[PDB]
């Protein structure tokens, strides 16, 4: 009913600024507070500030004003939020959502404020980094590889830059028994993550295993073999 | 034991999430007397 | 804002309660409670310290008095493991929420399986190594790993350990990757990865 649709991801180097758009649809925008949140990937909620789209008059928390600046546009029915000397701490989700209801339409009729709707959260990293594509290894348990350690075969992904990086197995024919660990932000400023096929060679689906791996921002294609 | 006396032997108190609890009050522990001759 | 416990992990079909406490900086009507899954848009569950939003199921129960505040939720599902954030109204300039309780309901109770990785070729003739030693089929998260050469390389300052990953084998899992110059594949005659879990 209510639809809060925001911009799509951002990547930044420190000292920078950035702007950020929540397009608003279903509901009468004039009427409505429109709120900026951040949350840091595992942290907590964060509210930065908000904006009467009907004149522009506009609220912050002191802990993000003169960073932040927020705007309203009643032509494009699009609120906007800019951040401004960039760090990697602002590494980020920033949701726009109401804390608001005129009506709270669909949710009830009071609104006491309280959060009703919200955007789809758009992501802001900040690196020292630039573009660059993975590198892909081969892990097999123990010293050498084994017949009874086909069981956990995996790859290490290494080093790339900025976010996603795709993964599956063996041509996308494989997922049974398929296994991936959280990807992690490097000291070099560039991402990696781990993944298996926790299934032996008992089978023509598993006699051989492949890490396919591609990573959208380079175009780069790896399709490496484990053994 | 009874903490806000309602009758006819129910007590009301504030307990655990804490609730107003009603429930038939204690008089005492128990106490089996070792006695012998 | 306080909220209890850290996390919240009791059993399915149960009631479990949790709580959400500020300083007197706040006002008494104005405190509501959302739910997060991973990577999704807060849901607004219950607002004005009580009232549950329209589409919103019977069995949660908001209640509490001066800034002392509480949400049960009751006939628990897995669908409630998420983590859970309260908010209240800085009385009038400023919105304040929650720490995000996670909702780590009871799965399972299990000791973790692992399986231990040494450098591979075409790491070290890429002029590098990385050592990785994988737990899996545990619960609760109560996990702790040691690296081994084979007395000790914990002290490494490349050493790392992601998150846990939760699974449909109501179970954590976990990996640990010790990244290496490829010469210490070539000092270290052994590499070895020791496990502690439940306790």
């Known amino acids: 009913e209510v639809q809060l649709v925001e911009s799509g991801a951002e990547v930044k180097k420190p000292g920078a600024t950035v702007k950020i758009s929540c397009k608003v649809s279903?509901?009468?925008?004039?009427?409505?507070?429109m709120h900026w949140v951040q949350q840091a990937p595992g942290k907590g909620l964060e509210w930065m500030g908000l904006?009467?789209?009907?004149?522009?008059?506009?609220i912050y928390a002191e802990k993000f004003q003169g960073r932040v600046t927020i705007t309203a546009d009643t032509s494009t029915d699009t609120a906007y939020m800019e951040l401004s000397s960039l760090r990697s701490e602002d590494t980020a989700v920033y949701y726009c959502?109401?804390?608001?209801?005129?009506?709270?339409?669909?949710?009830?009729?009071?609104?006491?404020?309280?959060?009703?709707?919200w955007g789809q959260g758009t992501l802001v990293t900040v690196s020292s980094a630039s573009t660059k594509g993975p590198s892909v290894f081969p892990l097999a348990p123990s010293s050498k590889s084994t017949s009874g350690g086909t069981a956990a075969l995996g790859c290490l992904v290494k080093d790339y830059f900025p976010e996603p990086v795709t993964v599956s197995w063996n041509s996308g024919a494989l997922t049974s028994g398929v296994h991936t660990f959280p990807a992690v932000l490097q000291s070099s400023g560039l991402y990696s993550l781990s993944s298996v096929v926790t299934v032996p060679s008992s089978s023509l689906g598993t006699q051989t295993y492949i890490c396919n791996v591609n990573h959208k921002p380079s175009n780069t294609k790896v399709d490496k073999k484990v053994e | 034991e009874c903490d806000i006396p309602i009758g006819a032997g129910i007590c009301a108190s504030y307990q655990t999430s804490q609730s107003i609890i009603a429930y038939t009050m204690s008089l005492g522990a128990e106490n089996s007397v070792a006695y012998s001759n | 804002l306080t909220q209890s416990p850290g996390t919240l992990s009791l059993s399915p079909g149960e009631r479990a309660t949790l709580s959400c406490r500020a300083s007197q900086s706040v006002s008494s009507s104005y405190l509501a409670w959302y739910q997060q899954k991973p990577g999704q848009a807060p849901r607004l569950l219950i607002y004005?310290?009580?009232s549950r939003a329209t589409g919103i199921p019977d069995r949660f129960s908001g209640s509490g008095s001066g800034t002392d505040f509480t949400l049960t939720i009751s006939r628990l599902e897995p669908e409630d493991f998420a983590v859970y954030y309260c908010?209240?109204?800085?009385?009038?300039?400023?919105?304040?929420f929650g720490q995000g309780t996670k909702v780590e309901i009871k799965r399972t109770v299990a000791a973790p399986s692992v399986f231990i990785f040494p450098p591979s070729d075409e790491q070290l003739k890429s002029g590098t190594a990385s050592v990785v030693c994988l737990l899996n089929n545990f619960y609760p998260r109560e996990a702790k790993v040691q690296w081994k050469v084979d007395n000790a390389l914990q002290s490494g300052n490349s050493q790392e350990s992601v998150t846990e990953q939760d699974s449909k084998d109501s179970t954590y899992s976990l990996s640990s990757t010790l990244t290496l110059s490829k010469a210490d594949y070539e000092k270290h005659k052994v590499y070895a990865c020791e496990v502690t879990h439940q306790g």
């Open positions: 004005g310290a009580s």
């Open positions: 279903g509901y009468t925008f004039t009427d409505y507070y």
């Open positions: 959502a109401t804390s608001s209801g005129p009506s709270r339409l669909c949710g009830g009729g009071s609104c006491y404020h309280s959060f009703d709707y």
């Open positions: 908010q209240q109204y800085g009385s009038s300039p400023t919105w304040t």
């Open positions: 904006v009467d789209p009907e004149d522009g008059e506009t």
